[PDB]
Amino acid sequence: VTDPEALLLLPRLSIQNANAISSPLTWGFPSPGAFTGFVHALQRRVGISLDIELDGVGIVCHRFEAQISQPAGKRTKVFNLTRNPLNRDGSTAAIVEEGRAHLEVSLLLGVHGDGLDDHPAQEIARQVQEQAGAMRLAGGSILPWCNERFPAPNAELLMLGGSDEQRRKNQRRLTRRLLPGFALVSREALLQQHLETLRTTLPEATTLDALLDLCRINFEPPWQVRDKPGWLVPIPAGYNALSPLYLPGEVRNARDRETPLRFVENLFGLGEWLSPHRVAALSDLLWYHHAEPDKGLYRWSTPRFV
Amino acid sequence: AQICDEALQYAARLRELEPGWSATPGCQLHDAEQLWLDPLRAQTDETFLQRRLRGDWPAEVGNRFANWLNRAVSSDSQILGSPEAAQWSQELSKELTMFKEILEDERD
Amino acid sequence: ILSTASVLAFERKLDPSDALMSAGAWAQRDASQEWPAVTVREKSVRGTISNRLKTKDRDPAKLDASIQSPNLQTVDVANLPSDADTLKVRFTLRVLGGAGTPSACNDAAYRDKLLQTVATYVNDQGFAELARRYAHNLANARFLWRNRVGAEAVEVRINHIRQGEVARAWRFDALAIGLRDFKADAELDALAELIASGLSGSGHVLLEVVAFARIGDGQEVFPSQELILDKGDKKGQKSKTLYSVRDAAAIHSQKIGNALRTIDTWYPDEDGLGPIAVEPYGSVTSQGKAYRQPKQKLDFYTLLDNWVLRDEAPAVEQQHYVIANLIRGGVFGEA
Amino acid sequence: ILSTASVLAFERKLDPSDALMSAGAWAQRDASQEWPAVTVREKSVRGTISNRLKTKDRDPAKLDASIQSPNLQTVDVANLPSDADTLKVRFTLRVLGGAGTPSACNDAAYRDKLLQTVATYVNDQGFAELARRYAHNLANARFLWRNRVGAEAVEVRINHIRQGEVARAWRFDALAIGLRDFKADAELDALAELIASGLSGSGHVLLEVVAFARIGDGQEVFPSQELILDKGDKKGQKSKTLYSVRDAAAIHSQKIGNALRTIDTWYPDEDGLGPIAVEPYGSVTSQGKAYRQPKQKLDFYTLLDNWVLRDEAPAVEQQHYVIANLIRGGVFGEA
Amino acid sequence: RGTISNRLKTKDRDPAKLDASIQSPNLQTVDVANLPSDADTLKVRFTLR
């Protein structure tokens, strides 16, 4: 929402069992809500001590390996599970299917505040890396890079540049540093205009049909595949209200009795895995929160993408 | 743009993941490329090839890469004798321009 | 209706050999058979940049940093030995005959019509102008391409080789016979009648053409140039490779064929430039210009399709040019 | 009802070898066993454009821009050395015999009828015309395909090889024996009786056929040309590649076998064109024309189906052509 | 390089179609094994158990 004064780069973090189930309709890379909740956890744990405000994540995903397996004779896939403990009686517990995946992402945390001036850049970069080393990103532990070739350090890029050329130089230097991955942005205006063209073709078509049409490899007869611009994916773009907002000590069995609970439901927007130098400014492509809590509509996106 | 960007990512993961560009010597290894061996010829040879890559700044790989995209197009003279070849050449020139300036600053 | 054939393949008449160049001294060109060959050797060249800058690299610091790192090449060079001032360029030339019969032709009627056309050409005027101009390009040493341009004295000895030996030997001074005038001499008419007899199919012609050139003691001779692989570095770059058959520099056979074919003084542009080589859409690679463009009706294909198909016989000059193209050979015909 | 068998695979009689070509001087052809072989070497050619333009590429600026960027090739060439004027093309020709017996046939009644028909032909008139024409195509050096058209003197030596050595040595003058007239000589009749005894199964025939060709000092010889892969760049294009068995130029075995098979002077067009190669639907791929088209009843297939199935025996020349196709071999039959 | 020499199924018996099909001859690269030029004996050697 606001512009970051600096752009921190947490380097390639190895996540071993992330959540492959991003949403009820999407499997694969975990939801960007996990990464925005991670940067809010980082702000809640060391952001208040350094007098900075870590907002926004650029999700890069150098490596992804889902713990899946294609069954024999089926085109679809199934998830490799774990073995839960037995019950108190000795029988096998009722299995619940949780998708696990191995990640390697690097995060662009947009850091703005009055703590960039108090501390050096390398100190606050090192302290948020040490705080991220004892955390988890989507349910999966962050592997801490022991006894390898060399440890990947951080770089807090002060985005306030003296010139346009030095700014473009350090943006290119950072893009070369997070290069083999694929930045994730939220392209929802493309989904809405594809819904507009779909409704032009056939009326009363809703945007779930436009989302599914942007998802699949659909064929057209003269046979030619309808082309897709980029790697468009369905992503859960936040939540939506189902119940009115309850009081803190009102709902039963909540997490805490001091925070208002509201029953919610996902909102599957459209995302687009694009390469990091297709953006020409890394102060875009960061994932912020947008709540508007009177209406529901607790959503996350990349504002200022285009 | 997607082809040029996948070429940039292939060069990135090949230059970063494998030390195999400086694994063995031979007679033919296409040594005019000098882009998929960035840390291979500088982090070991300090003044031998690093002084031949920073002053020379090898960015002539894009001219050889343009031959791939001329192989991607056919010999259709309905565009070669029309203004579609001009639009094709202008988009290829601006895209190899951005590929050149991305390839120019491998030294920083 | 007699449409043209889809394929037309004329085999090359006037086959030359690779012009093997050797070295020696003048005034013993009469004993010039054991002369040592001019060997192609390597030498290192270092150059500072001299090409045009493209208005972004015209900064003083950029240009000074660019001239601080000069490029290294190792070029093939062929020079005469230091005690030898004569370059013997020696090849052999067959004149085959049967200029109108194509080696490949689909339409039998078009092939018979083109054979009748060439037959009426040779009957009305035999290979007399073409053979005179080929004999000139043998007489003046135009096949010495750049080895001629500053030579003090060039002498061409052309031997007609019969059963195993010479039957009639010629001896020309290639600087008095100019590179642009097709005059008439007495020996040149005998050589032209020999090439005429070879071109008409009425006799076998194998000529050995031996050309000497006073270039100077240890000067550079210029054999033909091969192309390179472009796989190695930029210090041992090997930017220039010269032709050598067996440790002996040589001009290519098609360079000699191109210089023997420089008989075309009938192109619609100015004759103040001199002859060009007989090519369809008659084109020069140095000057970059295509004389006899097909918008004028003087290229080989429009002249041939008017002379054979619709019987619009051109002038004697343009049909000399057409028969010179049929002697030259080629892959004619559409797809 | 005697239907045609579904498969007919006739094996190849008259098996030739790869015609290895070496080089040397004339008048020492008797000591021509240690002659150096003609090596296929590379050379770079640079041409303009000379193909027909398609009425939309005839713009003058586009034509000049096309001749400003010429196509650089590298070609494989094989020349004689500069001190050699004789091309020794040597192969071996093995005549097997048993021309009628197929190697694969389903209908046994068709096999028995074909054997009875071919044995009726052989007993009526043995392999005498076919062997005379094969002996002519060994005698006149037609297997020297393009190495013959400008050759000054061609001499073919055919040595019948018994147990390890020569049993009968021939020596022909291939330019006096014409390329189109099958006359009768004394030695050619002895070679015809030898090939007759070979084709009839009454003897083992292994003829080492050596042919010399006075081309000239350092002139180009023309071995068989391979096909190129076309996987690389367009400056090192490698447009022409030549056949070579082991650092030695060579003509393909099926090219020699085709030049030996040019015995068919019985095709229904004019005989002023001369003999074409014995093929079903008898076709010359140079001239692009298939004589003995099946509209007329003179191809190999309708002649064989009339001779064997319904027993309408054709004329003498046509059944000579049929048995020449059976000597040639092939995969006859439906699918 | 070989021209067409197999049978025709009476629909391909047009003469212009036949000449057009022999104008584009089929090319192959076949694997062959020949003896050398100074060898006239083929030694086939195997074991039998």
DSSP characters over A58-82: -B--SEEEE-EEPPTT-SS-EE---
Cα–Cα distance measured from residue C19 to residue C89, given in angstroms and rounded to the nearest whole number: 6
Q: In this structure, are D133 and D243 located in the same domain?
A: yes
Cα–Cα distance measured from residue C17 to residue C203, given in angstroms and rounded to the nearest whole number: 20
- Residues from chain C that touch D220, judged by Cβ atoms under 8 A, are 15, 17, 253
User: Measured between CB atoms, which of B30, B52, B56 is closest to C231?
Assistant: B30
Which chain C residue is nearest to residue D235, measuring alpha carbons? C227
- Residues from chain B that touch A179, judged by Cβ atoms under 8 A, are 8-9, 12
Neighbours of chain A (3+ CB pairs under 8 A): B
Q: In this structure, are D89 and D106 located in the same domain?
A: no
| Interface mutation target, options C57, C71, C234, C238, chain B, most CBs of B under 10 Å | C234
CA distance E45 to chain D (A): 23
The token duo for A6 is 């600096």
The token duo for C318 is 């343009």
For every residue of D48-85, which 3-state class applies, written as one string? CCCCCCCCCCCCHHHHHHHHHCCEEEEEEEEECCCCCC
Decide if A183 contacts A60 (C-beta within 8 A). Answer: yes
Nearest-CA neighbor of D90 among D134, D34, D150, D130?
D34
Residue A38: phi, psi to the nearest 5?
Answer: -70, -40
Which chain E residue is nearest to residue D328, measuring alpha carbons? E5
Cα–Cα distance measured from residue C252 to residue D294, given in angstroms and rounded to the nearest whole number: 48
CA distance C192 to chain D (A): 19
Decide if C160 contacts C206 (C-beta within 8 A). Answer: yes
Segments making up each domain of chain A, as ranges = 4-181, 182-302
Cα–Cα distance measured from residue C219 to residue C151, given in angstroms and rounded to the nearest whole number: 11
Q: In this structure, are C7 and C17 located in the same domain?
A: no
Q: In this structure, are D241 and D274 located in the same domain?
A: no
Establish if D18 touches chain E: CB-CB under 8 angstroms.
Answer: yes
Cα–Cα distance measured from residue C113 to residue C108, given in angstroms and rounded to the nearest whole number: 9
Nearest-CA neighbor of D259 among D147, D158, D169?
D147
Cα C115 versus chain centre, distance: 27
Q: How far apart are the first and last CA of chain B?
A: 24
Could you give the count of Cα atoms lying within 13 Å of D224 in the half-sphere of its Cβ?
22
Which chain E residue is nearest to residue D245, measuring alpha carbons? E36
Cα–Cα distance measured from residue A33 to residue A267, given in angstroms and rounded to the nearest whole number: 12
* Number of compact structural domains in chain D: 2
Establish if E17 touches chain D: CB-CB under 8 angstroms.
Answer: no
Nearest-10 crossing angle of helices C316-328, C300-307: 110
Beta bridge partners of A103: A15, A64
Tell me which amino acid residue C212 is: F
The four Cα atoms B80, B81, B82, B87 give a dihedral, to 10 degrees, of: 30
- CB neighbour list of residue C101: distance below 8 Å, 6 or more residues apart: C115
- C-alpha dihedral sign at D88, D89, D93, D99: negative
Give SS3 for C267: coil
| Angle made by CA atoms A147, A148, A154, in degrees to the nearest 5 | 105
Q: In this structure, are C172 and C38 located in the same domain?
A: yes
Establish if E16 touches chain C: CB-CB under 8 angstroms.
Answer: no
The four Cα atoms D273, D275, D276, D281 give a dihedral, to 10 degrees, of: 90
Burial D99-124 (b: 16+ CB within 10 A, else e): bbebeebebeebbebbbebbeebbee
- Residues from chain C that touch E23, judged by Cβ atoms under 8 A, are 6-7, 106
| Cα Rg of chain A, angstroms | 21
Establish if D183 touches chain B: CB-CB under 8 angstroms.
Answer: no
Residue E23: phi, psi to the nearest 5?
Answer: -75, -20
Nearest-CA neighbor of D1 among D310, D305, D301?
D310
Nearest-CA neighbor of A295 among A229, A241, A232, A225?
A241
Q: What is the total residue count of chain B?
A: 108
CB-CB under 8 Å, C231 with B31: yes
Nearest-CA neighbor of D290 among D269, D320, D261, D316?
D269
- List C residues 295-334 in contact with D (Cβ-Cβ < 8 A): 295, 301, 330-334
- Residues from chain B that touch A173, judged by Cβ atoms under 8 A, are 105, 108
Token pair 């000067």 in the structure block, residue:
C219
Q: Which of D207, D241, D262 is the last residue of a domain?
A: D262
User: Measured between CB atoms, which of A173, A179, A230 is closest to B9?
Assistant: A179
CB-CB under 8 Å, E8 with D227: no
Identify the H or E element spanning C46: strand C41-47
Q: In this structure, are C238 and C285 located in the same domain?
A: no
The token duo for D67 is 């001749």
- Residues from chain D that touch B77, judged by Cβ atoms under 8 A, are 54, 56-57
User: What are the CA-CA distances from residue A266 to residues A29, A235, D10, D276 (Å)?
Assistant: 16, 10, 76, 82
Q: In this structure, are C20 and C121 located in the same domain?
A: no
Q: In this structure, are D63 and D85 located in the same domain?
A: yes
Q: In this complex, does chain D touch chain C, defined as having at least 3 beta-carbon pairs under 8 Å apart?
A: yes
Strand locations in D30-124 (E): 41-47, 71-79, 86-95
Would you put residue E11 in left (φ > 0), alpha (ψ -120 to 50) or beta?
Answer: alpha
Rounded to a whole number, what is the largest CA-CA distance in chain E? Answer: 60
Decide if C224 contacts C243 (C-beta within 8 A). Answer: yes
Establish if D57 touches chain B: CB-CB under 8 angstroms.
Answer: yes
Q: Which of C262, C281, C309 is the last residue of a domain?
A: C262
User: Measured between CB atoms, which of C15, C17, C285 is closest to D70?
Assistant: C285
Q: In this structure, are C288 and C159 located in the same domain?
A: no
Q: In this structure, are C19 and C7 located in the same domain?
A: no
CB-CB under 8 Å, D246 with E36: yes
- Residues from chain C that touch D219, judged by Cβ atoms under 8 A, are 15, 17, 92, 94
DSSP tally for chain B: helices H, then strands E = 5, 0
Residue D68: phi, psi to the nearest 5?
Answer: -80, -20
Q: Which of C210, C239, C262 is the last residue of a domain?
A: C262
Q: In this structure, are C113 and C180 located in the same domain?
A: no
| Angle made by CA atoms A93, A99, A102, in degrees to the nearest 5 | 130
Beta bridge partners of C303: none
- Residues from chain B that touch A169, judged by Cβ atoms under 8 A, are 105, 108
SS3 content of chain A, % helix, strand, coil (to 5): 20, 30, 50
Decide if D87 contacts D155 (C-beta within 8 A). Answer: no
Q: In this structure, are D270 and D191 located in the same domain?
A: no
- Residues from chain C that touch B67, judged by Cβ atoms under 8 A, are none
Establish if C120 touches chain E: CB-CB under 8 angstroms.
Answer: no
- Residues from chain E that touch D246, judged by Cβ atoms under 8 A, are 36
- Taking residue A221's Cβ as centre, other Cβ atoms within 10 Å add up to 5
Decide if A32 contacts A235 (C-beta within 8 A). Answer: yes
Establish if C283 touches chain D: CB-CB under 8 angstroms.
Answer: yes
Q: Where are the alpha helices (DSSP H) in chain C?
A: 60-68, 108-124, 129-139, 187-199, 253-260, 300-307, 316-328
CB-CB under 8 Å, D50 with C281: yes
Tell me which amino acid residue C306 is: N
CB-CB under 8 Å, B67 with D56: no
Identify the H or E element spanning C89: strand C86-95
The token duo for A195 is 């819904």
User: Measured between CB atoms, which of B2, B16, B102 is closest to A180?
Assistant: B16
Identify the H or E element spanning B90: helix B84-104
Domain that holds residue D204: 12-98+127-262
Cα–Cα distance measured from residue E4 to residue D279, given in angstroms and rounded to the nearest whole number: 9
